[PDB]
Design an enzyme around this catalytic site. Structure first.
Site, PDB file in Angstrom:
ATOM      1  N   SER A 136      30.251  37.482   6.807  1.00 34.17           N
ATOM      2  CA  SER A 136      29.506  37.355   5.678  1.00 34.17           C
ATOM      3  C   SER A 136      28.118  35.556   5.607  1.00 34.17           C
ATOM      4  CB  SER A 136      30.628  37.002   4.527  1.00 34.17           C
ATOM      5  OG  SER A 136      32.162  36.857   4.910  1.00 34.17           O
ATOM      6  N   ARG A 184      43.575  58.766  53.782  1.00 32.86           N
ATOM      7  CA  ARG A 184      43.209  57.944  53.424  1.00 32.86           C
ATOM      8  C   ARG A 184      42.333  57.316  52.747  1.00 32.86           C
ATOM      9  NH1 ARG A 184      47.598  55.147  54.981  1.00 32.86           N
ATOM     10  NH2 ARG A 184      48.694  56.062  53.361  1.00 32.86           N
TER      11      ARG A 184
END
Lengths: 439, 434, 436, 437
Positions: free
Chosen positions: D272, D308
């Site tokens: 703010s 893999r």
């Protein structure tokens, strides 16, 4: 400005890129922007000149309390005013109250991010220059080495390995031109204030913006762009386009590295592939990095929906994806650079793969040659029927051609072997290679 | 065409560019031009060129047979070639498709389709830019509240907000013309990219073919080098991202509780006014950004013909062109007849009762008290104005120093949100000047 | 339909389910059930329910008029509602759509369409499973080279590789059954979800409508809670992910230099002497589109408040495409697995590429007793590396080590260097997936 | 170790589960469990097992050397195995990693890490669900305007709106329980899945190791079969989608012009200007966007080739830790906001009264339906809504000027039909339906 790495931080990133997008370089960019702002506003007469000097003298990242900055960022919610609070407390006689004058935090983050991007693309331009140089060498060095081209992972017709490298080379040249085109848009100052109109600077914010812009060697902005993220997103989509080509390169190389293919190999480094299996780990890493960047590009496109004058969420997507996509891209660029500088090429295995079809791969060649002496029609029909007979019986195309007596009477074995030799049917590969090397 | 939503998330113009009939039409122009080139350079007899060009007609296609052939062959060209050869007399069609491969046709047809598609995009963009040019001017001095994190920030003008969209869409135009250099390029390389079957004539056929179709000649074959097609996709993503912001901001300003703009009045399009264009823009942009990722994925085509990645382009590029056209169409329509309600913008500016211009009060009071001391003092009055839901003017007047240094007539003017507009107008000038 | 590629990246059965016609058929089925439900409960007159149901027939819709009206109204239900009122006699038109909102119909229609779609998916999965059960048993003892990082690792059997796909598809089947009981759910909540215009009859109508349509009654309105639709999207992503791997492995085994499998032989399925893996090609491109589609559907979950201003509409586009793309992939995978050509001779040929290096690990263990586990390691390792540099059988280099040649005879040695003798418990693992 | 935003788009608890140290600790627990299993099975000597378990301690790892070896080897297990062998005495470390490959260790550790992560997620969900049960009850009778296409629709209650989130989060809880039985599975298959090196003891090792680690035994190897990991990823995408909607609604209701809710009050949490800022909502949004694109990359990763993957498997190395951390921050913020959410009934009431009765025109039509005709009243009230909205006048006032309307219904009765608080339907019954299990 001096020098943090986990097990994989230099596997899926690079030390250089990690430093560019580190908190320290970020906050340093912040302080450079603030110092330049002060100086600019001093000359303009907005803030005292002694204050500017003191501000500049404390615009040093080494004086930042990081644990305090982290805590204040978490409380304030954004990452600039925590640095501003320390800059004000570090200046004597209250002269710090003139920093961050009329600026909003996204002015600093957006402009920092542009500065970080410019540093990042300097590394990418270097990686691209080297990659292009290696491809230029590879296209020439391997200009005349025959190999089987592949369509749908099946052998097509012969080409040269330097031809294949020339096609990569032309692509990276396009990426380079894309890079220089987006730089003129991206290297732009962001300084607009809370809403983009610099309300708190009166009649002066736009003099401040124009002076700050080339104080930082950045193009002045047409208008504020706090929720207009097209500069940041096109960097992301460029990273996606570049890593796509890197990923194609990785795919082709790992495919040519298969035990059953064996036509190339990544550069030998002792015990790097983990008997002696030399796994294409650079290809592996490039693939994963490309996959992550392409999805990061979609996240940055998503981020362009920032509402009104500050996005309530979409803007913050850029804080996370941009550093990651930079680091992933640099890893992929590093690995392809390394692979292309010392790439092993195995012409004897390319030659062995060309001979797998026993001449069927140059069925056209035979046809074309036999045309004048046998007739366009018979040539077609005879070769097609001979090629198909060789397929069912696993025989050389030559041996079946020689059982056609009209063919055997018109041509001697020696002419027919040159037509049945895949190495004699390369079309204009070398002239095409020349067309790419010409500019 | 006949589908219920075919013109909601698509448009007729774009749908026909990418229709089976226009695609096969592009195929046939290519094969005819190829036959003309190869007759002039002596590769095929000139009576075959004439016979082939006269049978390069989309009206002559048996579509049910073509489809059944494509499903057998697997790719979409040799089914048309099979009909072109059989339609020719005494066998002069044996010389069509001479030395080409199917992807030479599909790739180059797609460039032609892309060029047709980008003419529409360029055309929509032009309309959108001028709408924004006039809106920026028309509402140049209409005050409104800027919003950060969906909270009110400080006052701006509605024309200022329009100038920011204006600058953005211009950059998209620059990106459009920029990619056009790369994209408008012939693809003619043959089975492996080297035109092996054309011998020493392959490069000549390519180069003269290129200028037959008004396309740049390629440096080298790009059958698995999809960066031209993927780059179009990421441009549509960038473009539809800006359209998505515009739809976001307009639908936010269309809220019952905000009511600051409205989509153009049509009939019973919504006692209603639903932002359905914004709705369609949103859904289109989301699908385009994901398709763009699919197009980057497609760049991994292996070797000289991709085993899957290439086909991703067959599906995604038409959809993304159609989605983008629908989004550009809706944004064009909304911007051309956009309703603007300055009285609602004003009502929203007054909601905070002066707190939205506390910064202006600080500046004005800084001259007589000091920037730093006036900032803290006005911030302290903002304490009392919000907790007690008062005008800031009233609380400012209860402070001695402020009342003693500034009078009520002058405090009412620092507290009027219509007076704290910054240099908005100069910024619209800077965007409208070029 | 009739598009060149409409049966290549899609299928007839799936196009029909998401067709405008079956969608509207779903709409009218819902409206008829609603009128009947509300007649039984007394909300509307029984003469209205009867007349309305008589006119809930897709054959009676003016399709061109429905299209223009949807384009003006913005949403795809009230155009069909308007024709339903005009087709009923004696003003009995709307006692239908009574208290319903358009998304009640779209959401509930989409649920019926998903159920029809998932009826197709469960059938293809059943066939894919059966083919894989047959292949895993058929090729249970067919040796081949396993591959890691596209390089050969150690021998396996081809049926072992199929059993690993099989175990994956069984998990996908479980996922499908699990989400069904969440997705097959009524949406009937009205404009804001509370059926305010039905008063104290809202829940009663909803629960009767759910039983009428063989759907679960909703806990509460879910007009902006898209998790049921999004989880169908993510399941199509998961399932096509596996299909994409299957496509990648089969096309990799179809390379000219590998040649271990081939798609079922059909005609000229593209000419040069020969057969491209186009089934693999289509699966790959369909997976790529489905996975991005699932991301758009996760994005769709951000529908604001009680009706989304955009996110909801993403589902109108993405869900039908993803269903069609997936069915194309499932059809191709079904077809490939039913008549997959397997070439054990090419598999054996590739096992013999390394001339024993691929089973160096077995040589070490086998030589351990007669040499010492650590000399065995060091000696086989160096013999293997000499064997590669010279392109000679590992056996021959082993027999050039005099200590080795003194301990074991050649018979024992190219039993250990025979790749077919090092297959582990592949068979017993296959059993675990078949469940004997 | 934490950077500026490490606890803003992440959480300490999740960052710690996926850290190098916790990952390597899982590796070492698996190696220890492996040696213990194989010692009992007689595959390795029991003296070796005892010596291997004693050195399975993360504290003894040289991290810089582990990094160096991992960059050279390429994969992140054998660098830890190298140190485990060397730290053992008398060469007894040569029996660790017996029959294992690195992905057995990475997959199974990733499973252990996921379980730990889902323990956090379950705790966040319980808290979110509990908060929503309280909010649905507490605000059961607080009236507000429902919204369709960001336009006011018909009235509902705020507790009805919260019950709708509550039902959604209970479905997410069910999805989590369902995937856990698939995900909590051992990976132990060796280089190619068949444990060739272990011979007739492979399956015996696998099943003993599984129950040693309190994990389901696997049907078969799954090194390139990533549906368990991709399934976790898509679940995070579903969950963060709901969190993203909650953030979109709360931030929409936090607008200056709406003012109906607010994030919990923390002194100066909103930057703010006397002002707040839905920063928690802001963070949830960015986290959901990154999680959802990661889900796509995890699906992309399912294309791992053969035994893999050459690239795709490595996507999971990066995406999974990030998505988990992003999700944990979105859950952290959502838990925080829901625990202390500010609800402003007076603003909800003010927003209801904006239309001056038009928002409940539907209720007037029903009420006037009895005496005039359900169809006729609709058209008659609808025509009156035009005058009220074109003249910016209350609907009540225009109704009292329609002559047959005023004849059939008095002012006092049109008060009630024009009061938006009287047209709430069966919101309380629907809330009850959700709260009731």
């Amino acid at each position: 400005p001096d020098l943090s790495a986990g097990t994989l931080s230099d596997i899926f990133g690079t030390p250089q890129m990690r430093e560019i997008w580190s908190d320290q370089n970020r906050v340093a960019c912040y302080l450079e922007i603030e110092a330049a702002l002060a100086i600019v506003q001093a000359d303009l007469g907005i803030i005292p000149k002694n204050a500017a000097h003191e501000i500049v003298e404390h615009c040093r990242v080494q004086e930042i309390d990081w644990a305090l900055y982290k805590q204040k960022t978490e409380l304030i919610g954004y990452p600039v005013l925590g640095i501003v609070q320390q800059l004000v407390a570090n200046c004597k006689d209250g002269l710090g109250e003139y920093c961050h004058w009329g600026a909003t935090t996204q002015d600093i983050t957006d402009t920092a991010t542009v500065m970080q991007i410019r540093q990042s693309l300097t590394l990418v331009k270097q990686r691209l220059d080297s990659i292009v140089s290696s491809l230029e060498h590879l296209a020439e060095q391997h200009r005349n080495v025959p190999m089987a081209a592949r369509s749908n992972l099946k052998q097509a017709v012969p080409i040269t390995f330097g031809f294949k490298m020339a096609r990569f080379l032309a692509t990276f040249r396009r990426h380079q031109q894309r890079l220089v085109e987006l730089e003129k848009r991206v290297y732009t100052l962001e300084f607009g204030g809370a809403a983009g109109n610099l309300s708190s600077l009166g009649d002066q914010g736009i003099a401040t913006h124009d002076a700050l812009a080339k104080m930082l060697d950045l193009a002045p902005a047409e208008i504020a762009w706090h929720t207009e993220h097209d500069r940041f997103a096109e960097v992301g989509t460029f990273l996606g386009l570049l890593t796509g080509t890197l990923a194609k390169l990785a795919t082709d190389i790992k495919l040519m590295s298969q035990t059953e293919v064996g036509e190339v190999g990544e550069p030998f480094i002792s015990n790097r592939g983990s008997m002696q299996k030399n796994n294409p780990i650079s290809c592996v890493y490039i693939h994963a990095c490309a996959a992550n960047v392409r999805q990061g590009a979609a996240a940055l496109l998503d981020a362009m929906q920032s509402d009104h004058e500050r996005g309530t969420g979409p803007w913050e997507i850029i804080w996370v994806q941009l550093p990651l996509m930079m680091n992933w891209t640099s890893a992929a660029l590093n690995n392809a650079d390394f692979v292309l500088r010392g790439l092993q090429v195995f012409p004897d295995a390319m030659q062995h793969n060309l001979d797998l079809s026993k001449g069927l791969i140059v069925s056209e060649a035979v046809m074309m040659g036999l045309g004048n002496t046998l007739g366009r029609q018979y040539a077609h029909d005879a070769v097609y029927e001979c090629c198909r007979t060789a397929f069912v019986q696993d025989r050389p195309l030559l041996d079946v051609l020689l059982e056609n007596h009209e063919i055997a009477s018109k041509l001697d074995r020696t002419e027919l072997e040159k037509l049945c030799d895949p190495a004699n049917y390369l079309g204009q590969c070398s002239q095409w290679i020349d067309r790419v090397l010409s500019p």
